[PDB]
PDB file of C-alpha atoms and ligand atoms in Angstrom:
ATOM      1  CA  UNK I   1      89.288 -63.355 116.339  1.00  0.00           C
ATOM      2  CA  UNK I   2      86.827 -60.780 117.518  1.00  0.00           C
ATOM      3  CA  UNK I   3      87.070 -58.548 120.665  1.00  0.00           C
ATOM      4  CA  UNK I   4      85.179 -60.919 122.579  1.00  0.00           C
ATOM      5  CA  UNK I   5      87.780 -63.324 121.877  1.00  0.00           C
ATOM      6  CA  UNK I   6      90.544 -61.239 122.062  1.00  0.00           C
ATOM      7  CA  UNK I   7      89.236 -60.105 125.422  1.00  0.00           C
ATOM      8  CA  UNK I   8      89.683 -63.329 127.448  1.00  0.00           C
ATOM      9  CA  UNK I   9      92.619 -64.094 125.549  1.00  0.00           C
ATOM     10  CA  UNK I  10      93.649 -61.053 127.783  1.00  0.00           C
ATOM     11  CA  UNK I  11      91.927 -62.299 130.912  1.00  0.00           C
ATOM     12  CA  UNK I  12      93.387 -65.842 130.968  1.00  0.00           C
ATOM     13  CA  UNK I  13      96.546 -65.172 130.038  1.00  0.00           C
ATOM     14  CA  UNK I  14      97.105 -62.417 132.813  1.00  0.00           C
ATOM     15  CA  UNK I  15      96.230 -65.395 135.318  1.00  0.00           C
ATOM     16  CA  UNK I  16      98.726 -67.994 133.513  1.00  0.00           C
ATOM     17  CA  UNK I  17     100.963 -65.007 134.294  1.00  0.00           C
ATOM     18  CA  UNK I  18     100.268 -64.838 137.778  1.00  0.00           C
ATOM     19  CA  UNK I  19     100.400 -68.375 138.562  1.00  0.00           C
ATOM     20  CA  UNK I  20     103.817 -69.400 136.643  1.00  0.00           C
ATOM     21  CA  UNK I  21     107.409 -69.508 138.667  1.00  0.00           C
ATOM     22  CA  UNK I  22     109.510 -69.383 135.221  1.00  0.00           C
ATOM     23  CA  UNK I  23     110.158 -67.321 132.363  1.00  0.00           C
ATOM     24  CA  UNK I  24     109.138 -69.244 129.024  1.00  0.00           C
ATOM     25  CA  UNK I  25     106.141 -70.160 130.578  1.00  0.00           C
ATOM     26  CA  UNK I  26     105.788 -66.325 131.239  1.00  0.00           C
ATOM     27  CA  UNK I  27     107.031 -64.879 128.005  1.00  0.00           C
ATOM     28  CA  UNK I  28     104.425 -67.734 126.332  1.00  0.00           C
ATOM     29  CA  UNK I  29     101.504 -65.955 128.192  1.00  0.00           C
ATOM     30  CA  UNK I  30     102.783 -62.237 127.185  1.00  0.00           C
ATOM     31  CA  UNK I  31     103.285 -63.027 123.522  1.00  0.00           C
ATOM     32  CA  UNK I  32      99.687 -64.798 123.614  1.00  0.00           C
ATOM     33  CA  UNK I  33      98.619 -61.211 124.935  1.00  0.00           C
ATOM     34  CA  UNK I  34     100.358 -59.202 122.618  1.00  0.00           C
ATOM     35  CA  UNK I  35      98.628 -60.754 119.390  1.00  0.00           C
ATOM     36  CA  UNK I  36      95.162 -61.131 120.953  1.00  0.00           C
ATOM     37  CA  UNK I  37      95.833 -56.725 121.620  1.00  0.00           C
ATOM     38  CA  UNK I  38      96.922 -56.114 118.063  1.00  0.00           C
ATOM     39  CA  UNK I  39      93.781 -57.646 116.409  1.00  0.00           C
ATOM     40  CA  UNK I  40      91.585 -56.278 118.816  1.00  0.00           C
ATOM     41  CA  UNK I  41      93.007 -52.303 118.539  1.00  0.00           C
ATOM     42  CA  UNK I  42      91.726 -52.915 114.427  1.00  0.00           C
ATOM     43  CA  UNK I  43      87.994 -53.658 116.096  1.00  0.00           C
ATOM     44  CA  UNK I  44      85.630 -50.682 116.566  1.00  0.00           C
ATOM     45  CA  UNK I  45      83.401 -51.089 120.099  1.00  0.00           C
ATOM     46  CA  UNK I  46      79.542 -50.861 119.861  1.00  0.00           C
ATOM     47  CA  UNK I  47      79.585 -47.845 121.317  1.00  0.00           C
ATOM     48  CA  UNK I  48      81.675 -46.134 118.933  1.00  0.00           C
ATOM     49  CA  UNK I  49      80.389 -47.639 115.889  1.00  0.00           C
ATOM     50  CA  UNK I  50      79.401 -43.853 113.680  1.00  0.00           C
ATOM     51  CA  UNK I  51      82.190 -42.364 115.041  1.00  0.00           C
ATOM     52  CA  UNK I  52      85.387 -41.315 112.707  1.00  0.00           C
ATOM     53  CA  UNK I  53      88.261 -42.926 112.472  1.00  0.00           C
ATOM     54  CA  UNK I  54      89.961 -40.119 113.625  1.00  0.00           C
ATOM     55  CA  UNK I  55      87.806 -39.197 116.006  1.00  0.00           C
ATOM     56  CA  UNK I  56      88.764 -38.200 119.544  1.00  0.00           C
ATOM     57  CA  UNK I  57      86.995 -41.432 121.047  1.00  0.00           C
ATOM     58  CA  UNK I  58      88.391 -43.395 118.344  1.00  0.00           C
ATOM     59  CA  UNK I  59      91.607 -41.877 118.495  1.00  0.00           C
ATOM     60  CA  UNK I  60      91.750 -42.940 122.649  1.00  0.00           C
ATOM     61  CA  UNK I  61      90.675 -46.093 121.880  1.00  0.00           C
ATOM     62  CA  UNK I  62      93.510 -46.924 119.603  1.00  0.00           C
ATOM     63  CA  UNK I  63      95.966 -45.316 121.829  1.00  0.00           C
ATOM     64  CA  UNK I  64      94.457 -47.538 124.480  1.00  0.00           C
ATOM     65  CA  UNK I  65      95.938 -50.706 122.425  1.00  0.00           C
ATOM     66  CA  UNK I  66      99.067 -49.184 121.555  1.00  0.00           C
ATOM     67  CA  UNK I  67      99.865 -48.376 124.772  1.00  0.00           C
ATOM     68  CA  UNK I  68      99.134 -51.337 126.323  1.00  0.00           C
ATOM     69  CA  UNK I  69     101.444 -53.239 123.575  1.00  0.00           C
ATOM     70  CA  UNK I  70     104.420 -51.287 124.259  1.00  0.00           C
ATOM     71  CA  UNK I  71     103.622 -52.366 128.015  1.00  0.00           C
ATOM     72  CA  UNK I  72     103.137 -55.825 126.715  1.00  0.00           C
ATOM     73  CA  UNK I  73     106.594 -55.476 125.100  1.00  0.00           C
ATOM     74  CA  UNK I  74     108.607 -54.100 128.009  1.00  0.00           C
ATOM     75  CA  UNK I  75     107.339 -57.164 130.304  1.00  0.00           C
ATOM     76  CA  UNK I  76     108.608 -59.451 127.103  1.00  0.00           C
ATOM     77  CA  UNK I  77     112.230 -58.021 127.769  1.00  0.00           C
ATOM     78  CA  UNK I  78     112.341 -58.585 131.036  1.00  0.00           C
ATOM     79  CA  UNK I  79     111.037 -62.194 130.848  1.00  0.00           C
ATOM     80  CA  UNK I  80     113.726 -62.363 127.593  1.00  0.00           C
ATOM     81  CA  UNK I  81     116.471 -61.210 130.469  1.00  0.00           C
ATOM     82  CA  UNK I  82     115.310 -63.789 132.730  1.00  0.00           C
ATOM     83  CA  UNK I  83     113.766 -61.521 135.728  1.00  0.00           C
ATOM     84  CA  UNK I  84     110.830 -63.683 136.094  1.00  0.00           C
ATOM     85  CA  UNK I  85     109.336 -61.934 139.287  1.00  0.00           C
ATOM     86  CA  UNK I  86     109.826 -58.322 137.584  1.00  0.00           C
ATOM     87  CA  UNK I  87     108.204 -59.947 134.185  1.00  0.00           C
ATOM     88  CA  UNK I  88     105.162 -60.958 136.948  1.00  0.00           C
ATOM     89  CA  UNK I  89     104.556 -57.712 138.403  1.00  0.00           C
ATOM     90  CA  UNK I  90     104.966 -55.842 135.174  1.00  0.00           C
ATOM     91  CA  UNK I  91     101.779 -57.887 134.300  1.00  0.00           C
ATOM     92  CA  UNK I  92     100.182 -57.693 137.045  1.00  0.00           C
ATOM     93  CA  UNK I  93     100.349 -53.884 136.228  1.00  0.00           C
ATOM     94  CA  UNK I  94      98.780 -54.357 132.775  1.00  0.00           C
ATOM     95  CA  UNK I  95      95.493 -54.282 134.848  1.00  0.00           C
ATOM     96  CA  UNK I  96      95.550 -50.760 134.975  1.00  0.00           C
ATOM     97  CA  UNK I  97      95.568 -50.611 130.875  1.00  0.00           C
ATOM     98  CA  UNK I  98      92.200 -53.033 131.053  1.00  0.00           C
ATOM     99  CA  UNK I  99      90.712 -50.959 133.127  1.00  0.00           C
ATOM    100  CA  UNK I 100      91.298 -47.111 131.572  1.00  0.00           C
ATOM    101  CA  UNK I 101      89.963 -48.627 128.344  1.00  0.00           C
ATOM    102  CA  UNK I 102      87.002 -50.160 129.891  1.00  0.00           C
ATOM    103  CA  UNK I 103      85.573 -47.157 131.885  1.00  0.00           C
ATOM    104  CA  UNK I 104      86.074 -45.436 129.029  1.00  0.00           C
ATOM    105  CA  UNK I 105      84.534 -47.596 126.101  1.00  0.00           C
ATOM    106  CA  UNK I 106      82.836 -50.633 127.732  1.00  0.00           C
TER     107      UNK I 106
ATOM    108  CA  UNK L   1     106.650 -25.220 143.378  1.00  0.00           C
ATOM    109  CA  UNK L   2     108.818 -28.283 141.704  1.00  0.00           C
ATOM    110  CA  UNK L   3     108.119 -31.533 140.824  1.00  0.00           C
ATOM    111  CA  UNK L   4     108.234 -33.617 144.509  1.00  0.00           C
ATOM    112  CA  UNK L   5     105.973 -30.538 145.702  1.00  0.00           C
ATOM    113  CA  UNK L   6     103.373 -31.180 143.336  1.00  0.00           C
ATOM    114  CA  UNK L   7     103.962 -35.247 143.959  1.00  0.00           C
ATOM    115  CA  UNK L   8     102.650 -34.536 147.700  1.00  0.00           C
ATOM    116  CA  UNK L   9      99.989 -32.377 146.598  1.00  0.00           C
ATOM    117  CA  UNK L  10      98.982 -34.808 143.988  1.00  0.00           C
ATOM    118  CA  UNK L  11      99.581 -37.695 147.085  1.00  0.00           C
ATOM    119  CA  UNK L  12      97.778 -36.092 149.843  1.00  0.00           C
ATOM    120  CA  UNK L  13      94.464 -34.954 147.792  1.00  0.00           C
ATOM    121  CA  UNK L  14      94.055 -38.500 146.175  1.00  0.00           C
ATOM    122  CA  UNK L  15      94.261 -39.553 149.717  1.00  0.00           C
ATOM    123  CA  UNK L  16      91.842 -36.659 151.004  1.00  0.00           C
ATOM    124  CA  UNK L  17      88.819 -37.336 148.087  1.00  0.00           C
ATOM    125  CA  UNK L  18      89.055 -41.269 149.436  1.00  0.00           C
ATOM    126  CA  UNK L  19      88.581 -40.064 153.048  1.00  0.00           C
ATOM    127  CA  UNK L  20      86.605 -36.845 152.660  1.00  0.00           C
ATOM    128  CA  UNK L  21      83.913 -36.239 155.011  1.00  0.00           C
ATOM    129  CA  UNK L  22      81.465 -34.453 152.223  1.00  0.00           C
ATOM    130  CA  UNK L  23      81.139 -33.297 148.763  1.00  0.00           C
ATOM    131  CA  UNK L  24      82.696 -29.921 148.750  1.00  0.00           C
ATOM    132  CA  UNK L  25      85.968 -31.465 150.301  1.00  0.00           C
ATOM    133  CA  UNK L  26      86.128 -34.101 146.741  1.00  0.00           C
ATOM    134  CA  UNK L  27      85.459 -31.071 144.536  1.00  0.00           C
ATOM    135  CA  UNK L  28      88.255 -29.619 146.363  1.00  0.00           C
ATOM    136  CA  UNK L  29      90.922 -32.144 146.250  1.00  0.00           C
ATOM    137  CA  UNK L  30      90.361 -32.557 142.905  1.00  0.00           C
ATOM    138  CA  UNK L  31      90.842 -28.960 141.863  1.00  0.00           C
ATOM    139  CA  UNK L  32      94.168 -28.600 144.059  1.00  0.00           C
ATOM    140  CA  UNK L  33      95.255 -32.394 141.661  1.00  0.00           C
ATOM    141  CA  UNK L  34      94.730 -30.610 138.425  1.00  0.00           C
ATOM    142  CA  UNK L  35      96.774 -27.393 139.372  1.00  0.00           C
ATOM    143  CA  UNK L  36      99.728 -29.940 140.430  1.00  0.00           C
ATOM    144  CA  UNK L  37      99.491 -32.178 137.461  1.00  0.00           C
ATOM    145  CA  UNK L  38      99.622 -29.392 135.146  1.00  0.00           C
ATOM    146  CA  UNK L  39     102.481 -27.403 136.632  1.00  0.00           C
ATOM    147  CA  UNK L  40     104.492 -30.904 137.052  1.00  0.00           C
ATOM    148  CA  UNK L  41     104.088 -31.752 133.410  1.00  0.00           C
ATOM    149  CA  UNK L  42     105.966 -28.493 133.053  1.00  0.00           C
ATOM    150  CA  UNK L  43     109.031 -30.216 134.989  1.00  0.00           C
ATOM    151  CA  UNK L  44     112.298 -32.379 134.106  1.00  0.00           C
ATOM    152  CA  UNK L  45     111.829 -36.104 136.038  1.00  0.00           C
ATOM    153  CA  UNK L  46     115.479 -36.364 136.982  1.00  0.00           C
ATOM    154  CA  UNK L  47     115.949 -39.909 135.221  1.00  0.00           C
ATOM    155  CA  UNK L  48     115.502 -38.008 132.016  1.00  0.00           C
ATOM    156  CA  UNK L  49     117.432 -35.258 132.556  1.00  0.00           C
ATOM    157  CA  UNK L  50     119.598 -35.418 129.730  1.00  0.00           C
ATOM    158  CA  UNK L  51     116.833 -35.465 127.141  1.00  0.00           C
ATOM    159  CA  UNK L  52     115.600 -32.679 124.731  1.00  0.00           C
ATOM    160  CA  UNK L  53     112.228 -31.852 125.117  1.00  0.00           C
ATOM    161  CA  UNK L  54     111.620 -33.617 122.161  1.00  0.00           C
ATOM    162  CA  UNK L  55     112.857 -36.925 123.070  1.00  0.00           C
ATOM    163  CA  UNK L  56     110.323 -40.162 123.465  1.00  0.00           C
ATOM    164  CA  UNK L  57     110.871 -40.182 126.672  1.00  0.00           C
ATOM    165  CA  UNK L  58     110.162 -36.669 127.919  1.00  0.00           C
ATOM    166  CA  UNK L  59     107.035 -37.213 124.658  1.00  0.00           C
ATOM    167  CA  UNK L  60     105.062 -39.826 127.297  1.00  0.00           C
ATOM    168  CA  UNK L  61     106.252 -38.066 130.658  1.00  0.00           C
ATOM    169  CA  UNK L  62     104.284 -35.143 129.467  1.00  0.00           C
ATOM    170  CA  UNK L  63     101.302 -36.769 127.802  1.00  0.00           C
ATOM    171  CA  UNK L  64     101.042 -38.925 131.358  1.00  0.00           C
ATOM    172  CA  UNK L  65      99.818 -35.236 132.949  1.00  0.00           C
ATOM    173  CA  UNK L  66      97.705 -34.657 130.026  1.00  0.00           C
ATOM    174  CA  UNK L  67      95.869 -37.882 130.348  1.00  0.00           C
ATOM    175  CA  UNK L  68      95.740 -37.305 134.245  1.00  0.00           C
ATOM    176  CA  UNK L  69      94.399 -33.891 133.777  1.00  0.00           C
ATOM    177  CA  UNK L  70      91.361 -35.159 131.661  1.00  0.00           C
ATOM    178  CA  UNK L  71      90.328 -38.086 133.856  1.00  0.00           C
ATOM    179  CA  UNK L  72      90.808 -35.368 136.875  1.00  0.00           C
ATOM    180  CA  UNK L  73      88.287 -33.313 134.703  1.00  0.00           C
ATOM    181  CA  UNK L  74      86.149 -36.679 134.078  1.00  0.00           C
ATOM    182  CA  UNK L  75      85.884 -36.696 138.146  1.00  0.00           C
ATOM    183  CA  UNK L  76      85.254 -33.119 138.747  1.00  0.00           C
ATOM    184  CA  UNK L  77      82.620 -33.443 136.109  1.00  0.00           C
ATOM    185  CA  UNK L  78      81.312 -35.901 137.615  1.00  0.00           C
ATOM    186  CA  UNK L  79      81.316 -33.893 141.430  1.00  0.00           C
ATOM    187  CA  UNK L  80      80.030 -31.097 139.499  1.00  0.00           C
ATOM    188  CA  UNK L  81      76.679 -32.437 138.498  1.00  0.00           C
ATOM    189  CA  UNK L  82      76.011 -34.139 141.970  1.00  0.00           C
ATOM    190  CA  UNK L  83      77.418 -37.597 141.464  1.00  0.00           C
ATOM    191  CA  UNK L  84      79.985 -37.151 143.955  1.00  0.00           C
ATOM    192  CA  UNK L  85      79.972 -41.085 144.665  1.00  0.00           C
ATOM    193  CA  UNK L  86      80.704 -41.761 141.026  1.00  0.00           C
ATOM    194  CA  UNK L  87      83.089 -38.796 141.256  1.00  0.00           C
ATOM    195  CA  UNK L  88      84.884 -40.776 144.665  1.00  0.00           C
ATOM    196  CA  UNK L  89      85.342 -44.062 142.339  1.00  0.00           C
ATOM    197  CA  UNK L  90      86.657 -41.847 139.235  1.00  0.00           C
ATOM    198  CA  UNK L  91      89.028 -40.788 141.892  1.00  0.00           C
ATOM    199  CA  UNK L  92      89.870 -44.298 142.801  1.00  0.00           C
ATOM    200  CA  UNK L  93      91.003 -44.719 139.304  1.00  0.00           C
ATOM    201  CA  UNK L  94      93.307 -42.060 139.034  1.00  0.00           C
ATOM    202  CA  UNK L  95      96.074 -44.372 140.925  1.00  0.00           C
ATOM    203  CA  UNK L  96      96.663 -46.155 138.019  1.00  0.00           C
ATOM    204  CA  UNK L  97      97.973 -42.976 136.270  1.00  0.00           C
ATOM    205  CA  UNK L  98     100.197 -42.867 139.119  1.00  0.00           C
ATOM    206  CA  UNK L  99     101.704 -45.971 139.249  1.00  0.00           C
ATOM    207  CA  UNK L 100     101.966 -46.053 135.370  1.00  0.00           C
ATOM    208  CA  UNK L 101     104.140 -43.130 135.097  1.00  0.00           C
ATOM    209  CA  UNK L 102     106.212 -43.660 138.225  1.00  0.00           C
ATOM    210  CA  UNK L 103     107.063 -47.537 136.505  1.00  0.00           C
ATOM    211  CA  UNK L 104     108.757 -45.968 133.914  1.00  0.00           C
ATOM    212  CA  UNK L 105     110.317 -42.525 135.015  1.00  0.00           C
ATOM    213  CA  UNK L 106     109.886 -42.453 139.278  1.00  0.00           C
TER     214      UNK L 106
HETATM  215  C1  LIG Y   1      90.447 -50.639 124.924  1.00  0.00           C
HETATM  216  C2  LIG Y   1      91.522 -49.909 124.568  1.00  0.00           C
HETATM  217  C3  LIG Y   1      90.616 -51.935 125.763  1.00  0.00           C
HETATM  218  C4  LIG Y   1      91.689 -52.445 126.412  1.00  0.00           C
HETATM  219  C5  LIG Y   1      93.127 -51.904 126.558  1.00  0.00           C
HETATM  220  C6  LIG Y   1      91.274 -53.671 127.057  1.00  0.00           C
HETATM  221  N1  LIG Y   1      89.945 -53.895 126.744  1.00  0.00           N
HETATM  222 FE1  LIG Y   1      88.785 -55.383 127.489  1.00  0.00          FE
HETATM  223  N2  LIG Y   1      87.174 -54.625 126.529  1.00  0.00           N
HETATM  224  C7  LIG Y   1      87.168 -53.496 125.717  1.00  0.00           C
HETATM  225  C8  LIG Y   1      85.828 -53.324 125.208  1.00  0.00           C
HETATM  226  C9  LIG Y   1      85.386 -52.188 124.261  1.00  0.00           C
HETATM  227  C10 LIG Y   1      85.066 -54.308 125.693  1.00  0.00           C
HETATM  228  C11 LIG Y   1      83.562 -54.520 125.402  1.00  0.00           C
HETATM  229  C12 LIG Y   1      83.411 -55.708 124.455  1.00  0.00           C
HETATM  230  C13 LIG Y   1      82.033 -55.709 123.847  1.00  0.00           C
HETATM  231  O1  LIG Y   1      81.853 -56.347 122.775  1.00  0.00           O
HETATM  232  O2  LIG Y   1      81.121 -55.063 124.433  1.00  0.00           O
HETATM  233  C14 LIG Y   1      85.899 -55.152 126.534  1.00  0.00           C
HETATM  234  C15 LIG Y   1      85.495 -56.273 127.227  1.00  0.00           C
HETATM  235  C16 LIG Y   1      86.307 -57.091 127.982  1.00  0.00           C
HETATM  236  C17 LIG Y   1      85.915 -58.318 128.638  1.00  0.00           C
HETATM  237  C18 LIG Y   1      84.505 -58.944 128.603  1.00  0.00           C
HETATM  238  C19 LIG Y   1      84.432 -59.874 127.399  1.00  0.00           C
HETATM  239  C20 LIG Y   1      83.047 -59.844 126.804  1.00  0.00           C
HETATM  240  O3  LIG Y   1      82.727 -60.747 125.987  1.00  0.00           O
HETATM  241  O4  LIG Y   1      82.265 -58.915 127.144  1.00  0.00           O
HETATM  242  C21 LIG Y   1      86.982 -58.818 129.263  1.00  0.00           C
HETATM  243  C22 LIG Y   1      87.056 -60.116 130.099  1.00  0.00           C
HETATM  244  C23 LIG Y   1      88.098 -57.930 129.045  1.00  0.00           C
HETATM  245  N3  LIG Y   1      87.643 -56.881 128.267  1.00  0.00           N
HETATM  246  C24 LIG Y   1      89.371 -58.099 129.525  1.00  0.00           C
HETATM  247  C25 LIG Y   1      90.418 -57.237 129.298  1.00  0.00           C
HETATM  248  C26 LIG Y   1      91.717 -57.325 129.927  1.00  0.00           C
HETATM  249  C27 LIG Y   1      92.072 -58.407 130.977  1.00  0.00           C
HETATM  250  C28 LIG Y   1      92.479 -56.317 129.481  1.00  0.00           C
HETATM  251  C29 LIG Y   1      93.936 -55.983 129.872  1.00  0.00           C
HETATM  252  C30 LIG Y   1      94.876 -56.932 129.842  1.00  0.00           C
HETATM  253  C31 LIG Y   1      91.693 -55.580 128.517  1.00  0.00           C
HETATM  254  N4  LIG Y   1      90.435 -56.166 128.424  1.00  0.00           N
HETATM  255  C32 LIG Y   1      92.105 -54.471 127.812  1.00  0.00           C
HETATM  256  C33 LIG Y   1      88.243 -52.680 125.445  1.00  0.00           C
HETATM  257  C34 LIG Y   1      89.510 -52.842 125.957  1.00  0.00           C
HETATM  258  C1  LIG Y   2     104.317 -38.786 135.205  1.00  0.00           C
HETATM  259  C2  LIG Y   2     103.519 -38.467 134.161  1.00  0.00           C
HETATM  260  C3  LIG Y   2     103.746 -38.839 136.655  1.00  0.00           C
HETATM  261  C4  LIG Y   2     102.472 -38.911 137.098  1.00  0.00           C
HETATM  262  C5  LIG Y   2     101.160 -38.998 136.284  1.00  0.00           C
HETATM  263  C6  LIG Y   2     102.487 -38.951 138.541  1.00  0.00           C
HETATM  264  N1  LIG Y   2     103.804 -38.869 138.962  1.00  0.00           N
HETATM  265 FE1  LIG Y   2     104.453 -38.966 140.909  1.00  0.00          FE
HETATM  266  N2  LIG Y   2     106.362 -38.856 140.277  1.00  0.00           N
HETATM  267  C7  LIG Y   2     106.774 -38.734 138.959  1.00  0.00           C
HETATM  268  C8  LIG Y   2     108.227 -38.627 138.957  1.00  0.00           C
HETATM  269  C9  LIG Y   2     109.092 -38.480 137.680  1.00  0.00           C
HETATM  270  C10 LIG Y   2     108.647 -38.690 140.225  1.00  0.00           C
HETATM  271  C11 LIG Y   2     110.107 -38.601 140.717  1.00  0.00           C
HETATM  272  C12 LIG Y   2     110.394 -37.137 141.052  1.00  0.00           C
HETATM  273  C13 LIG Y   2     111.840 -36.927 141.434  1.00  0.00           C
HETATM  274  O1  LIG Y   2     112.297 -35.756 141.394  1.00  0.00           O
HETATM  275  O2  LIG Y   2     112.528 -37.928 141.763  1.00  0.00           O
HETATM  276  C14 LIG Y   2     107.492 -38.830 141.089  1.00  0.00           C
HETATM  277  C15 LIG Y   2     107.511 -38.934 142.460  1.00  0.00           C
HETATM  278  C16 LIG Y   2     106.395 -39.045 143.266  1.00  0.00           C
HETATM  279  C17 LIG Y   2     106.383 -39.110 144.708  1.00  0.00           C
HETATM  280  C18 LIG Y   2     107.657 -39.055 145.571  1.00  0.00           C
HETATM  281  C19 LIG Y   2     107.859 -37.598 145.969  1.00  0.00           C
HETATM  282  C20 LIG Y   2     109.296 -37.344 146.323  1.00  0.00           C
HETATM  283  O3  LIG Y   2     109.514 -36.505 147.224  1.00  0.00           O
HETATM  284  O4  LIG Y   2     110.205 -37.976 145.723  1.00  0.00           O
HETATM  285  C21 LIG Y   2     105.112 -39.196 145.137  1.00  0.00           C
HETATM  286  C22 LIG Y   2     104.565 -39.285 146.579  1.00  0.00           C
HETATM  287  C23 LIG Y   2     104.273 -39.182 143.959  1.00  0.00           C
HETATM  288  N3  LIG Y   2     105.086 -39.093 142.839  1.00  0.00           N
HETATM  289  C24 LIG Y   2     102.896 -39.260 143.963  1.00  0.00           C
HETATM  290  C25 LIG Y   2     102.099 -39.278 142.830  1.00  0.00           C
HETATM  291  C26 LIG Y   2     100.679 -39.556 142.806  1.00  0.00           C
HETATM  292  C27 LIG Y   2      99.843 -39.853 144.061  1.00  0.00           C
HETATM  293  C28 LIG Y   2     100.246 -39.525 141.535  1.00  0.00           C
HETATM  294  C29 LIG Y   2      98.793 -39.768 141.020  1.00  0.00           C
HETATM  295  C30 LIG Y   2      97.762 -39.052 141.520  1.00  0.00           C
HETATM  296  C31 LIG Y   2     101.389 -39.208 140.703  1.00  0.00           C
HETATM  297  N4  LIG Y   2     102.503 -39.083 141.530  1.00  0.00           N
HETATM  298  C32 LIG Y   2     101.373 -39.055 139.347  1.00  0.00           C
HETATM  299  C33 LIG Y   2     105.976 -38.710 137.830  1.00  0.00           C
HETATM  300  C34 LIG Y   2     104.596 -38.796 137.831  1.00  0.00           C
HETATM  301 NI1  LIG Y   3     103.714 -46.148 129.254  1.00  0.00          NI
HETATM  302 NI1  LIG Y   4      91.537 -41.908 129.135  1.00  0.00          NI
END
């Protein structure tokens, strides 16, 4: 949807994470995550809106989605390998990503 | 200095800024961060020590110090133009890029 949306999309899913005990309902949440950060990295915040596209604030903002997709995508291989708890706090360390972006940008 | 030298520089002035008794001692700890972060990007994190300096992973090891060194300059901006408060928080921040790097080469 829109980055609204997208952004408790994020929220939720981090606490589905949190609360689970298995892996599918773990690697559920994460790929939920993943899509709702891929639509939202193509979004340009309010606060950017005349900048470039390859501007420097643009440019960190983008990176901020990217990065937090390949983060997305290393806690999907270790729910795929069954190491729930390590899937969990891999997550849990997401938060970081929300935050970075949001100081900056929000 | 080597890298674990500038890990307990970078350790004990994260902890000094949170603790700091006034403003020059922030300014301070902040200063003697950026000097370690930018000689330790200059380093070889043991777990990739058999990769060029071109490879991926020796790519994000480095840009972790760059990002590190501009929210260090965020805070010290921040100290610099009175707002050591908002400077402490920035600070507070800055854990993240800790724990982020160490996840995937500590
Ligand atoms: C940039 C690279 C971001 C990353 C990574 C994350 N978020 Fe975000 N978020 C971002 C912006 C620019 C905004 C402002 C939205 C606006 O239209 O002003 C937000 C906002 C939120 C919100 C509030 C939702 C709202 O309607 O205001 C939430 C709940 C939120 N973000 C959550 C969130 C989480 C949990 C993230 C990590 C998993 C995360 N965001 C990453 C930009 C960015
Ligand atoms: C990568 C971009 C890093 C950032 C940013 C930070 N650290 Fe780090 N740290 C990193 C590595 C690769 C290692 C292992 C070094 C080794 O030779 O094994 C470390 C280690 C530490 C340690 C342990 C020190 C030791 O004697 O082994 C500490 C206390 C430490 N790091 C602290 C620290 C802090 C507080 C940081 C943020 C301010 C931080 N590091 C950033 C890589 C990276
Ligand atoms: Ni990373
Ligand atoms: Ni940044």
């Amino acid at each position: 949807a829109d980055l609204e949306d997208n952004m408790e999309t994020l929220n939720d899913n981090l606490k589905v994470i949190e609360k689970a005990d298995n892996a599918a309902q773990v690697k559920d949440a994460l790929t939920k995550m993943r899509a709702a950060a891929l639509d939202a990295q193509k979004a340009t915040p309010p606060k950017l809106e005349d900048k470039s596209p390859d501007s420097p604030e643009m440019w960190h903002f983008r990176a901020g989605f990217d990065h937090l997709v390949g983060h997305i995508d290393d806690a999907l291989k270790l729910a795929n390998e069954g190491k729930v708890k390590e899937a969990q706090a891999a997550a849990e360390q997401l938060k970081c990503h929300c935050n970075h972006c949001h100081q900056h940008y929000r």
